[PDB]
Structure 1
Amino acid sequence: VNKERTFLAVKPDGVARGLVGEIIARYEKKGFVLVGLKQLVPTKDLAESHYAEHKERPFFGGLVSFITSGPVVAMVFEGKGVVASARLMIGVTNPLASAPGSIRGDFGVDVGRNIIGGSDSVESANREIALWFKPEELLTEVKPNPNLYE
């Protein structure tokens, strides 16, 4: 369905580096529709829940501390296959291994400063969207450009 959604966060490094607009632009050019958007400084609570699946992993700590270190631009995008697509557009975890053309491939070098984060499955997307956004913050009236879908 063309109403699938995903959660993307331009991390503190992406924001500090002035990449918010560039990133949003990539998803707009693709045809995806912004249904949620805000800048905030994530609270430890938020980050911990966001990255709950990594509570164990040794890098969990610094990650939580990093995402809460400064402003982040949280976004929700809607469109057909947007979850998988946005990940393809982001690249892979390691920016050095990300293909040119992808966001990490074009802009990053370090795993811990990998610019943006995106939901890895519809299940996770739904969970993270609910986490970062109040329902009234998400559009209900979505208007994709009439030339994008059959």
Structure 2
Amino acid sequence: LQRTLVLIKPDAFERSLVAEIMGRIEKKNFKIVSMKFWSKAPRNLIEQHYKEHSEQSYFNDLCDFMVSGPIISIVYEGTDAISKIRRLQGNTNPLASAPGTIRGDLANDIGENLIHASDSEDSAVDEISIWFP
């Protein structure tokens, strides 16, 4: 049993895909244990969330996008939730994400990619602490 942190990104709101994305996770039998709606996430939480990318060329654009609309932060619980939801999510690169995955079916950009999911036990604990202190 694990908990993982998911963000529904602003593009999902723009494209009316919030329920589509949450529903794929729900259908896999993962349970919501915490959830918050952000009309606009604070810049600082975004920058901490993506702190590992702070020196990357895309950092400012990434942060700007992430505050360009609402987000939902969700903690999901289930056996091996971290790796399983990562598999549902699909590759960051739209040249690679597989049909059947969230990004494979729905995302068409490396940045506007609909969903964040924690990538490891340690990052899940960190991200949960950021969004649900």
Tell whether the structures are fold-level matches, with TM greater than 0.5: yes
Distance 1:71 1:14 in 2: 9
Q: What is the aligned partner in structure 2 of residue 62 from structure 1?
A: 61
Q: What is the aligned partner in structure 1 of residue 77 from structure 2?
A: 78
The aligned length equals 132
Q: What is the aligned partner in structure 2 of residue 28 from structure 1?
A: 26
Distance 2:19 2:69 in 1: 17
Distance 1:49 1:111 in 2: 20
Q: How much has 1:96 moved relative to structure 2?
A: 3.3
Q: What is the aligned partner in structure 1 of residue 35 from structure 2?
A: 37
Distance 1:9 1:47 in 2: 11
Give the alignment of 1:109-124 within 5 angstroms: 109-124=108-123
Distance 2:13 2:124 in 1: 21
Q: Identity rate of aligned residues, in percent?
A: 46
- Structure 1 counterpart of 2:52, which letter? E
1:80-112 deviations in whole A, cap 9, x for unaligned? 111011110000111332111100000011101
Question: Where in structure 1 are there 5+ consecutive unaligned residues?
Answer: 135-150
Runs of 4+ in 1 over 6 A off after TM superposition: none
CA-based RMSD of the aligned residues comes to 0.9
The TM-score with structure 1 as length reference comes to 0.85
Q: What is the aligned partner in structure 1 of residue 103 from structure 2?
A: 104
Q: What is the aligned partner in structure 2 of residue 145 from structure 1?
A: none
The TM-score with structure 2 as length reference comes to 0.95
Question: Where in structure 2 are there 5+ consecutive unaligned residues?
Answer: none
Cα pair 1:7 1:75 within 8 Å, conserved: yes
